[PDB]
Design a binder for these strands. Sequence first.
RNA 1: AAAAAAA
RNA 2: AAAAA
RNA 3: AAAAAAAAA
RNA 4: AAAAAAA
RNA 5: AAAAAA
RNA 6: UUUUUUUUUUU
RNA 7: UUUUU
RNA 8: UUUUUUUUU
RNA 9: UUUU
RNA 10: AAAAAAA
RNA 11: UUUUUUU
RNA 12: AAAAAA
RNA 13: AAAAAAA
RNA 14: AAAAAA
Lengths: 146, 150, 157, 144, 144, 144, 157
Amino acid sequence: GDNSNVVTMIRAGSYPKVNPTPTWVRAIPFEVSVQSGIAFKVPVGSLFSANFRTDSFTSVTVMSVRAWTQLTPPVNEYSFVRLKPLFKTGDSTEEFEGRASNINTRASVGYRIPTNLRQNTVAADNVCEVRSNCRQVALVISCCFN
Amino acid sequence: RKSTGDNSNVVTMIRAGSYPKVNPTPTWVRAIPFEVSVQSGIAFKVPVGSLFSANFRTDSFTSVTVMSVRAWTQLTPPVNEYSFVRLKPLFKTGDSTEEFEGRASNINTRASVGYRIPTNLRQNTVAADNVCEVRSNCRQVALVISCCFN
Amino acid sequence: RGKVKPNRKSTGDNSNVVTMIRAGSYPKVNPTPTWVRAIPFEVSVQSGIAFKVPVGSLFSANFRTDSFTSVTVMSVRAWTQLTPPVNEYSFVRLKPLFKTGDSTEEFEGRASNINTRASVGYRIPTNLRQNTVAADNVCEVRSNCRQVALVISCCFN
Amino acid sequence: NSNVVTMIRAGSYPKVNPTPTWVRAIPFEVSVQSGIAFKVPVGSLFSANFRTDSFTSVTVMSVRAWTQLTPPVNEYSFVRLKPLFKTGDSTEEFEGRASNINTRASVGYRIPTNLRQNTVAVDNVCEVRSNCRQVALVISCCFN
Amino acid sequence: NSNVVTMIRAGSYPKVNPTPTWVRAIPFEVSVQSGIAFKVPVGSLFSANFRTDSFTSVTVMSVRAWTQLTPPVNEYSFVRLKPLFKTGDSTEEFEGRASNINTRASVGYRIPTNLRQNTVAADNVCEVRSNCRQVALVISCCFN
Amino acid sequence: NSNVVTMIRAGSYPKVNPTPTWVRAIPFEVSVQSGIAFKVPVGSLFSANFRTDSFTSVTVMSVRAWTQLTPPVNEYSFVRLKPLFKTGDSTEEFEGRASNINTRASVGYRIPTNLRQNTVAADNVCEVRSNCRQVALVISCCFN
Amino acid sequence: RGKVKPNRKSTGDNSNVVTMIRAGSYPKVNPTPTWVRAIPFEVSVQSGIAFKVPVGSLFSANFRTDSFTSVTVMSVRAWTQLTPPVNEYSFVRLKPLFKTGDSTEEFEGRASNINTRASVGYRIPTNLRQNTVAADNVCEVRSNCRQVALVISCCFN
RNA sequence: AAAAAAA
RNA sequence: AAAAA
RNA sequence: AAAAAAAAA
RNA sequence: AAAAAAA
RNA sequence: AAAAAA
RNA sequence: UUUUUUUUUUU
RNA sequence: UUUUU
RNA sequence: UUUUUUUUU
RNA sequence: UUUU
RNA sequence: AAAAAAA
RNA sequence: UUUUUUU
RNA sequence: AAAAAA
RNA sequence: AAAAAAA
RNA sequence: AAAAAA
Ligand SMILES: [Cl-]
Ligand SMILES: [Cl-]
Ligand SMILES: [Mg+2]
Ligand SMILES: [Mg+2]
């Protein structure tokens, strides 16, 4: 073990259980385009792509969403970003907002989904609404692909 | 061995007794964020009515017990200057003459400052009242007020 | 024992004169040994295309590593060397490359301040630490900045 | 101990392998000239004189050298070893000199775990330099 | 341990140095005439055969010397070393003799910390005296 | 404590020294051209602006350097230091770069005790290289 | 006590400047002191005859012991400096000599290898450690080799 | 368990 | 001391 | 994981 | 124990 | 466990 | 790395 | 856990 | 400690 | 938490 | 080293 | 570390 | 117990 | 505890 | 509690 320098025999037993398409817990980074004064609905379909090795999945259980302002804010302003979680059983009305204390620095915020509200979502569904004075917002979402 | 049980999967029955004491419109401790417009060299009185709003779920209240006030500069300062902000607490029994000032050591960084109201001065304030005066070289200031709505 | 040949080594660890070394048989020597190094050099990237970092950049007279023809890379760290495009924050991606098979990871770091560099690195496992000659590549660098700084921890042999 | 045969209560047919591996130290000689390096081939390890004519690959761990013949007149024996690798040859020259003219010169080097891959007969182990006409080599390897 | 690449959460750019120092033990030989001292030049340390040709100065810490060739007939090998300094040469003759005619003669001297300054190629390390025509040197020094 | 003068029962006359040594941390700036090294003169330490114009020699212990002006457009500030010695200049380029374009770049090097000798005004401390036109220096040294 | 004259002796054992020494009365001095030494020199012997080693060989500019006229010998060690005759192994004999009375011992060492030196020594007791001038002899050396190396441990005064 | 905050 | 995986 | 093989350098 | 994952 | 050394 | 209130099983 | 004195 | 044979949880 |  | 276990 | 049956 | 020295 | 004061 | 510094 860890000191061997050649191949060694494994005394395997019966054929085991198998699963060629298991689950995967991931953190998916991507960006969205946002306009001023309007809220953008983040689609779940942005997670199922070949760029994330997840084009083979058709459902996902989201756990937490984190957002950063990807582009600079308007002139004389500080960056901010808001998040309103969305659920098929009932959308929420929260506005988890974080503002940058430096014009040159991003504005970050996030929210964690409780265990009772951690069901599956499909590409047609939406995660949350994003609001910002910046034009582009980078998102990092922790979730469990299944 | 047999004593593992706090994860329920089905509905359980609640053996309730007499009718309890209820209150459909209780109090609420909050941290209300909002912004105000500020002019150069001119002090702006922050109205308490800014706290009662549907944008804060507080439009149903008519009075509030303010505990502490914090302020951040919301826009950039003038050219060559660092951001600053001042606060002067106001009270219906007698306004204060303190100017708690917090400046910015970085021109690109907000200027922050705040004050805490003592227990002896934590009374209700209606919308017509004012919380404090705000002075800043920036044209807009952001506030976060820890208050108890009732 | 015996008596003295006066080499005045005062208090052992504090002599001010040359002292005789009682040498013995000729030892094992190596005029060209190995050298574990952290080599700082810059590579240039275009906005939207990848750039393969040649291993030959490590061997140079600017690094004293000019007598080597092979090197074992341990870990690669990257920093954006130039400012990002307007309105944008800095970012840098690293995709490890190996002769036995290129990888597909994109270890990315993004600067939260437009004036600050974006940094990210990756460590090569022990089972993949073989030699790489000048004709080989280390990794693929992507960035919105025109130049990326690299500090490669490696062993020259 | 015993004096007669005993019964073994065997069970299922175990995992077998008619051609296993073998960790060895292979002693063989090479011819070296003055001022020129000799690339020791890995094919020298595979031979019927070492019970390794059935192996096609091997994993070298450490290499040791000894001057097999007397040095030139007025000189002391020395021997150099430059490790060679398919992913990239080295430039080290691990050298050992003899302090007595009538005594061998000994030197050796160890291959790290990260460089211990298989080498076929076409490959080379190391370059051997010596002022002596022959060098004795004892190579600790793992035949597979 | 790990079998794949792992991310390194790097931070700010660190302090770098592409041309660092190097502590070495340089082996080289010199020719020695009978009854004559040879001033070992410092420039012998700077060479592409030692990977040190990129340096221009070096801090010598200790010097060791062996006889590289056989002594004259009926004699035992000997070797002497006289430390040389730009601020003032010494007059010590650290001598070492062999107890077997077939064996080398070895001797050395350590430089005190107060006398460990830089030396350039034009400078000399020490004077060497021997009945043998060549002397093997191993100098522990600090390239900078 | 005491509120008035108190007598000092002095004895014999003591050993005096009107011109003693002084350990300092001298701050001064130098101009640096792009792509060119600047030999920092030792004489910059001897000045009435540092109270050290009464000295003629100084023992440098450590050297630290910051970028005093802003870098060129789109670049991050950097600074290099090459230690210089009369007994032999070095080839190290202790470089430090900034991670923020608006922030200085800092780097330094410590001189070993064996290389801590006196230097006069004509001598040079180190070579400095930077993309900025000025470099702020703080040199820990011993005036004597 | 009082206040300071600033001699910056950093951490006591690590000052980088000259520091004042508070000297007092003039001490006891000796411009020509003693010197305990181990003097290496060679003497030549013939096969079958003895050779008296003069004490004057110790005083020389080659040993820095040129200003001395007397010396106290403590111990004598000998080594054959040249090869032995053919078929023979090396041997060396030492017979101590003293002014108060020569001795008759023959402390002999023989080399078990024809290529190796033959070594032997003798220590002089404290009751016999007086001074010997250049006109005196140390010991008688016998050997089959033509030259014998001597390392004499002594005190020069 | 859920609402200021704190290095 | 009882149940239902 | 019995022997053969580098060594805690 | 290795890799992916939250402060 | 690199390269130097009471 | 340390709290005020809406309900809230259990020691 | 779930259902029972 | 490692490579192959045998023991024992 | 997913694997044999 | 021989019978019925070896936990 | 269980033990009990003829050389 | 030689010759130098917080 | 500060200053003046005896060995 | 001055001025320098793993
Ligand atoms: Cl011949
Ligand atoms: Cl069940
Ligand atoms: Mg950048
Ligand atoms: Mg002899």
